[PDB]
Amino acid sequence: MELFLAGRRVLVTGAGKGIGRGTVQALHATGARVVAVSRTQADLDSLVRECPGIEPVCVDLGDWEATERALGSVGPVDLLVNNAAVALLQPFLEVTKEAFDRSFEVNLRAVIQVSQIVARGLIARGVPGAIVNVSSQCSQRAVTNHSVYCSTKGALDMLTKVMALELGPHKIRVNAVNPTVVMTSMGQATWSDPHKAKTMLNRIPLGKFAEVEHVVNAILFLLSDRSGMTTGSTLPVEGGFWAC
Amino acid sequence: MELFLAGRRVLVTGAGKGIGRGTVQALHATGARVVAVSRTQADLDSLVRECPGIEPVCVDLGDWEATERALGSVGPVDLLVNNAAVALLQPFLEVTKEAFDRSFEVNLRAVIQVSQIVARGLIARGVPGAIVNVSSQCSQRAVTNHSVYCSTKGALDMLTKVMALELGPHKIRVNAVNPTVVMTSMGQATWSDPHKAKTMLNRIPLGKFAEVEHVVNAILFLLSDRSGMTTGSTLPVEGGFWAC
Ligand SMILES: NC(=O)c1ccc[n+]([C@@H]2O[C@H](COP(=O)([O-])OP(=O)(O)OC[C@H]3O[C@@H](n4cnc5c(N)ncnc54)[C@H](OP(=O)(O)O)[C@@H]3O)[C@@H](O)[C@H]2O)c1
Ligand SMILES: NC(=O)c1ccc[n+]([C@@H]2O[C@H](COP(=O)([O-])OP(=O)(O)OC[C@H]3O[C@@H](n4cnc5c(N)ncnc54)[C@H](OP(=O)(O)O)[C@@H]3O)[C@@H](O)[C@H]2O)c1
Ligand SMILES: O=P([O-])(O)O
Ligand SMILES: O=P([O-])(O)O
Ligand SMILES: [K+]
Ligand SMILES: [K+]
Numbered sequence: 472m473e474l475f476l477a478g479r480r481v482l483v484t485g486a487g488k489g490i491g492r493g494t495v496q497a498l499h500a501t502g503a504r505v506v507a508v509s510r511t512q513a514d515l516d517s518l519v520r521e522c523p524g525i526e527p528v529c530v531d532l533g534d535w536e537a538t539e540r541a542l543g544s545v546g547p548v549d550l551l552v553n554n555a556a557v558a559l560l561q562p563f564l565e566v567t568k569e570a571f572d573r574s575f576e577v578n579l580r581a582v583i584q585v586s587q588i589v590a591r592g593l594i595a596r597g598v599p600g601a602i603v604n605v606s607s608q609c610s611q612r613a614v615t616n617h618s619v620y621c622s623t624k625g626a627l628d629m630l631t632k633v634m635a636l637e638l639g640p641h642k643i644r645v646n647a648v649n650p651t652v653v654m655t656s657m658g659q660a661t662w663s664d665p666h667k668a669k670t671m672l673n674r675i676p677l678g679k680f681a682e683v684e685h686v687v688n689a690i691l692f693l694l695s696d697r698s699g700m701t702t703g704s705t706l707p708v709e710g711g712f713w714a715c
Numbered sequence: 716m717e718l719f720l721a722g723r724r725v726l727v728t729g730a731g732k733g734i735g736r737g738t739v740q741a742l743h744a745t746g747a748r749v750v751a752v753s754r755t756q757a758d759l760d761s762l763v764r765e766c767p768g769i770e771p772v773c774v775d776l777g778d779w780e781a782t783e784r785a786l787g788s789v790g791p792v793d794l795l796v797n798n799a800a801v802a803l804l805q806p807f808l809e810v811t812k813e814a815f816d817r818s819f820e821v822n823l824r825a826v827i828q829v830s831q832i833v834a835r836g837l838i839a840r841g842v843p844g845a846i847v848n849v850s851s852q853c854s855q856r857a858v859t860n861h862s863v864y865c866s867t868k869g870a871l872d873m874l875t876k877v878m879a880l881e882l883g884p885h886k887i888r889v890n891a892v893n894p895t896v897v898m899t900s901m902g903q904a905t906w907s908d909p910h911k912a913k914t915m916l917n918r919i920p921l922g923k924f925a926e927v928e929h930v931v932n933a934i935l936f937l938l939s940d941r942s943g944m945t946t947g948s949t950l951p952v953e954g955g956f957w958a959c
């Protein structure tokens with residue numbers, strides 16, 4: 472099923488590791504031109520060795536001022552994948568001001584900032600485009616010790632809908648994908664213990680966690696014109712967790 | 716908190732046992748006039764003995780024609796509680812035509828028929844009113860062997876919403892209540908295995924099942940003018956089941 476990403480310029484945040492890195496790889500291989508944004512330069516360095524021709528951009532997206540100086544000069548971007556996030560887990564009664572702030576600055580405020588930059592350029596060129604926000608299964612279902620993280624993702628699902636509403640007349644689509652655990656570093660830091668994992672597994676009808684590949688496939692579908700009448704949506708990649 | 720039910724005429728379906736029976740008693744105590752509809756006569760005989768003054772109507776609500784003949788002549792009814800239902804549990808691959816038909820005739824078609832009769836009368840008298848549909852936590856979360864039952868409750872939630880929409884201009888509110896397991900006869904036949912109740916109990920934050928009185932409290936709030944701007948909703952009485 473052609474998806475018409477060959478040739479397009481795509482920006483991916485949090486591309487150094489995990490889902491964002493596999494997204495860059497998938498995109499490169501299909502022919503799109505990629506701008507890889509990430510916090511750690513050594514991740515970008517290896518990625519430009521593996522995926523020749525991408526453009527690396529190293530910046531901490533939690534810093535509004537520094538992001539604007541690094542990204543303002545990126546140029547024409549057709550497609551955008553907002554993937555960077557942090558997961559700072561704390562029981563509710565132990566949540567601190569600093570964990571709150573950092574989590575919201577990276578997981579949500581950055582999503583606004585980068586999206587504005589790409590959406591202003593699409594409008595100025597008068598062309599259509601698409602944005603995918605990587606959310607989570609726990610945007611809609613509570614998990615212990617995840618009150619701050621799950622609130623950013625709950626906020627992100629809603630941000631996705633207002634973006635979709637306000638950007639729809641400029642033919643820019645905006646969608647979220649909501650995966651279950653993925654055994655990236657972020658998932659393995661938390662669900663590596665056979666027992667905690669087990670309690671989640673028993674709730675997943677397909678009886679397994681997601682692979683990076685499942686997530687990328689959903690991302691690529693939502694970026695392509697194949698999903699031309701889908702916007703404001705939250706696409707689950709959670710093996711059926713939300714259904715039961 | 717005055718909910719001003721005294722003096723109005725309320726119809727309750729499935730009044731012979733469980734939540735419906737508990738609803739009739741609560742209303743009876745508050746001075747409302749109750750029409751009690753149920754399938755089994757002996758259930759209504761003892762109900763009239765404990766709550767003198769209620770009007771019993773004995774009829775099988777799955778029978779459209781008998782219901783019309785039984786209820787067409789019931790008089791001014793201000794408030795309606797659609798509580799009667801059947802739970803015919805079969806694995807999806809064993810669902811039969813008969814279990815399907817019987818479940819939808821009782822759990823949904825009867826809701827339409829009795830609500831039409833009550834809504835027509837209210838509109839003729841030009842007075843406001845309120846309808847509560849008793850739904851379920853399984854209206855939005857799947858449970859094994861409940862494909863038909865959960866579908867009737869999912870249909871009920873949505874019916875509630877269209878009812879709310881069309882009857883809104885006539886000052887009739889329509890809401891649903893969505894309880895977790897309750898240890899009526901309906902709850903005791905399924906969840907009586909200790910290992911059974913355990914699976915679900917661990918997914919309920921308040922760590923217990925619902926009592927009849929919790930459900931009745933919610934029905935009464937939704938019938939009262941205390942909930943005057945609430946229509947088309949599904950109020951969970953499930954100890955937080957839906958939240959995680
Ligand atoms: N893995 C799962 O269990 C899972 C489940 C549901 C949803 N998700 C979502 O999937 C997305 C990716 O997660 P993942 O598992 O791929 O995580 P990961 O393996 O930890 O990678 C996240 C990437 O984002 C980068 N990043 C984080 N904060 C940054 C910042 N302030 N500025 C620039 N880049 C930053 C990280 O860089 P550094 O490592 O250099 O900091 C890393 O390259 C997230 O939005 C996450 O919430 C993941
Ligand atoms: N108990 C639970 O765990 C639970 C959980 C979530 C939601 N709910 C909902 O709560 C409501 C009541 O449940 P419950 O536990 O109170 O059930 P129950 O104890 O079995 O009582 C149901 C009542 O409805 C009557 N009824 C059933 N079919 C009828 C028909 N065709 N015509 C006339 N009357 C009929 C029954 O009469 P007969 O017994 O004489 O047939 C009985 O009096 C239902 O809508 C049920 O789906 C119950
Ligand atoms: O809700 P998560 O922790 O499985 O992403
Ligand atoms: O009606 P249920 O969801 O308690 O089985
Ligand atoms: K997670
Ligand atoms: K049930």
